Every structure is written in structure tokens, then in C-alpha cells.
Write a protein that holds these residues in place. Structure first.
Motif, PDB file in Angstrom:
ATOM      1  N   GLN A  74      45.013  17.344  84.240  1.00 30.80           N
ATOM      2  CA  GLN A  74      44.333  18.392  84.975  1.00 30.80           C
ATOM      3  C   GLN A  74      44.116  19.572  84.019  1.00 30.80           C
ATOM      4  O   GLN A  74      44.895  19.784  83.080  1.00 30.80           O
ATOM      5  CB  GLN A  74      45.161  18.816  86.200  1.00 30.80           C
ATOM      6  N   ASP A  75      43.049  20.335  84.245  1.00 27.87           N
ATOM      7  CA  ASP A  75      42.801  21.514  83.435  1.00 27.87           C
ATOM      8  C   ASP A  75      43.993  22.471  83.573  1.00 27.87           C
ATOM      9  O   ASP A  75      44.452  22.737  84.696  1.00 27.87           O
ATOM     10  CB  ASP A  75      41.500  22.212  83.830  1.00 27.87           C
ATOM     11  N   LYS A  88      42.528  26.175  85.097  1.00 26.39           N
ATOM     12  CA  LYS A  88      41.801  26.174  86.366  1.00 26.39           C
ATOM     13  C   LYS A  88      41.884  24.775  86.998  1.00 26.39           C
ATOM     14  O   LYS A  88      40.872  24.062  87.064  1.00 26.39           O
ATOM     15  CB  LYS A  88      40.337  26.638  86.171  1.00 26.39           C
ATOM     16  N   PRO A  89      43.095  24.382  87.467  1.00 22.00           N
ATOM     17  CA  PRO A  89      43.289  23.029  88.011  1.00 22.00           C
ATOM     18  C   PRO A  89      42.409  22.686  89.223  1.00 22.00           C
ATOM     19  O   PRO A  89      42.089  21.519  89.415  1.00 22.00           O
ATOM     20  CB  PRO A  89      44.785  22.983  88.361  1.00 22.00           C
ATOM     21  N   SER A  90      41.972  23.685  89.990  1.00 20.60           N
ATOM     22  CA  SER A  90      41.004  23.466  91.079  1.00 20.60           C
ATOM     23  C   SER A  90      39.681  22.813  90.611  1.00 20.60           C
ATOM     24  O   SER A  90      39.023  22.103  91.382  1.00 20.60           O
ATOM     25  CB  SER A  90      40.694  24.789  91.806  1.00 20.60           C
ATOM     26  N   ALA A  91      39.301  23.059  89.358  1.00 18.72           N
ATOM     27  CA  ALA A  91      38.104  22.460  88.777  1.00 18.72           C
ATOM     28  C   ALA A  91      38.279  20.989  88.412  1.00 18.72           C
ATOM     29  O   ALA A  91      37.291  20.323  88.098  1.00 18.72           O
ATOM     30  CB  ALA A  91      37.657  23.251  87.556  1.00 18.72           C
ATOM     31  N   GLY A  92      39.516  20.487  88.424  1.00 20.30           N
ATOM     32  CA  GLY A  92      39.786  19.067  88.209  1.00 20.30           C
ATOM     33  C   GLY A  92      40.276  18.785  86.805  1.00 20.30           C
ATOM     34  O   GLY A  92      41.099  19.534  86.261  1.00 20.30           O
TER      35      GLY A  92
END
Length: 340
Positions: free
Chosen positions: A27-28, A31-35
Motif C-alpha cells: 500500500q502507498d 496516502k493508503p486511501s489511494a491504494g
């Protein structure tokens, strides 16, 4: 315009490709929400001849994001987009830029290395610079706006970015066949610390250059016995950066050199001197910062010193070629001093 990046060392034809890589194992980190962690990469390589015009330095949109206006989109490189590679797989140099800075800012170094016969990969680290993805998607340096940025973390996660780029580029169905037996890594500032860190973590890497980045991760306890060039600016008279490199020096136990450009700046090892001097807006760099960031080394000399010393290092460790630039002062480069 007819304006170009600095003339590379030779006139062999050069190709370039841009790669959108996605590391689906991570995961990034920012910014883990971005995938998943995705990376943009620019390749430069000896190619077969083409009658196609050379690729622009940059798109209009990314020039706006990097500089504040589109002028750098009018500047041409010397590498032809999509040209067929030359026949023999070449030794690979991977490049990583300074924090907040685009990978395009290492274009003059990258092309020059390519003209000397290397495969070169410059890597953008997402959310640590403005970066252009396919479909015109421009991601911004969101970590630039965060007081909670840890520079050690950046280095550790950049080490993972670069190991993944090596996996893609040395692997089957790589977009560019490289000689995986001979791998170097260099970077500017935090990319420079990252270059040394990935060599420390990855056995495939044979030699590393840190272009003027402080170390932010704790050393390996036994030390690092692989080849390292430390090439800094103004560290002869900056106590805290010198000390940082003094601590790092004692844990380097193999081939090593520490060079300084006392009258240079932090940006001397990049395209920025050339960008600012030829295309800078009034006050592009605030007057007080000019000494620290550029010093007095001209755009031409900044580019030539960086190219010549970087090439000499990689030729030494990857291509069996000596260079007196690495061992003693050069009267062709009076700007360079030896710290050890």
C-alpha cells in the motif's frame, strides 16, 4: 526556441520510454486511501538511429507544477521517445531525485550516462514531488505540506521503491533489457541517502552515489563494505552536514571517497541551476537562499562536474575503467575538493 538540455558526452543515438509501474505488494505509505504504491519512471538508453524529433523535457502541465509556468515544455532533450534499443544489454544506473523535486530534474545526468553507454532509470516517488501519470493525472507533493514527515521513513520506503524498480527492469518482459550483473544507484539529496540505503538492503546493487543528502537512517552495525561516493556542496563550511557525513564515513568499510564542491550549492547536482539561470522567474529562488542552493558554480560547470564525476564513479565500479578524478584534484575541475 531551439533550446536544449546540455550536450551529452557523445553523439550515439538515445531512446527514452516512460513507465507507469504499480507495486501491488505494498500500500502507498503516505496516502493508503489511494491504494497500491505506483511509480513513474523515465528510461534513457543507447538506441538505434531514428529520424523522429527528440522528446520534450516535460509536458506543459507538469512544467506549470514544477516551475510555475510552461516554458520548460519548449526545451528539447536528445532522446527519441520509443526508439528501438541498441543490441547489447547495458549496465543499469538508477536515479532518484531530491525531496519535493521531479525526476525530470536529473535529465542532463541521465542522458549523459545513456550517451556513455548505460541504461538509466530515473524514478519518481509518488506524493514526494509533482508527478504526471497516464491520462494526464498529476499528483502533487502532499508530503511537502506535512510537518509530520520523517526523513528516515522516506529513505526506508524509497529503498523499497527502488528494489521494486530493479525487479521490474531486471525481470522477464522488462520494457528494457539490462545487464543485471552491473547495477549502480545514485541520487540527489534524500534520493542520494536512498541510493546508499537500497545498496545496503539489496545485493544486486554494486555501487552507490550520494549527491549531497544527509543520512537519516541508522547505519548497519558491522558497516557497509560496498563502493560509495559522497559528493557534497559547501560541507567544508557547514558544521552539521559535515558532522552527519563524518558519522556516515566511519560505518563505510569498503571503497569510499568524500568530495566537496565548496562554492557550489545543494542544487548543483541537478538540472535546477540550468533551469533557474536560463528560465527562472524573478526571485525563482529567494535572494538569501541562492548561496546555499546554487552558490557560484555556473549551470554549465554544475552539469559538467556532476556528469564527469558520476560517470567516472560508475565506469570505475561497473566497466573496469580507471579515473584520476576519483583519487586526486583535477585541474580541469578546480571546483572539486577532497575531504578525505
Amino acid at each position: 526556441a531551439g533550446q536544449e538540455v546540455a550536450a551529452p558526452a557523445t553523439r550515439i543515438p538515445l531512446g527514452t520510454k516512460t513507465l507507469h509501474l504499480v507495486d501491488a505488494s505494498r500500500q502507498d505509505p503516505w496516502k493508503p486511501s489511494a491504494g497500491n504504491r505506483e511509480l513513474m519512471v523515465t528510461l534513457w538508453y543507447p538506441s538505434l538511429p531514428s529520424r523522429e524529433p527528440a522528446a520534450p523535457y516535460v509536458s506543459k502541465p507538469l512544467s506549470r507544477a514544477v516551475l510555475g509556468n510552461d516554458v520548460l515544455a519548449g526545451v528539447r532533450t536528445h532522446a527519441v521517445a520509443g526508439a528501438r534499443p541498441a543490441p547489447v544489454p547495458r549496465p543499469l544506473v538508477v536515479l532518484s531525485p531530491g525531496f519535493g523535486m521531479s525526476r525530470i530534474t536529473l535529465t542532463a545526468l541521465g542522458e549523459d550516462l545513456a550517451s556513455r553507454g548505460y541504461a538509466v532509470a530515473a524514478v519518481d516517488h509518488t506524493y514526494e514531488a509533482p508527478v504526471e501519470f497516464p491520462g494526464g493525472r498529476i499528483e502533487k507533493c502532499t508530503l511537502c505540506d506535512d510537518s509530520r514527515m520523517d526523513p528516515g521513513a522516506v529513505v526506508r520506503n524509497r529503498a523499497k521503491d527502488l528494489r521494486f524498480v530493479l525487479d521490474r527492469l531486471t525481470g522477464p518482459g522488462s520494457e528494457l533489457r539490462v545487464d543485471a550483473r552491473r547495477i549502480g544507484v545514485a541520487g540527489h539529496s534524500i534520493g542520494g541517502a536512498s541510493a546508499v540505503e537500497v545498496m545496503r538492503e539489496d545485493r544486486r546493487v554494486d555501487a552507490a552515489i550520494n549527491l549531497d543528502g544527509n543520512f537519516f537512517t541508522e547505519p548497519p552495525a558491522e558497516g557497509l563494505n560496498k563502493p560509495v561516493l559522497l559528493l557534497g556542496a559547501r560541507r567544508s563550511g557547514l558544521p552539521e552536514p559535515q558532522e552527519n557525513w563524518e558519522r556516515a564515513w566511519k560505518q563505510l568499510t569498503g571503497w569510499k571517497r568524500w568530495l566537496d564542491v565548496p562554492a557550489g550549492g545543494h542544487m548543483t547536482f541537478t538540472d535546477v541551476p540550468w533551469i533557474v539561470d536560463r528560465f527562472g522567474m524573478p526571485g525563482q529562488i529567494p535572494p538569501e537562499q541562492v548561496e546555499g542552493q546554487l552558490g557560484t558554480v555556473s549551470a554549465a560547470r554544475a552539469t559538467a562536474v556532476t556528469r564527469n564525476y558520476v560517470a567516472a564513479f560508475f565506469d570505475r565500479h561497473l566497466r573496469g575503467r580507471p579515473s584520476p578524478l576519483l583519487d586526486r584534484p583535477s585541474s580541469a575541475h578546480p571546483e572539486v575538493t577532497f575531504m578525505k
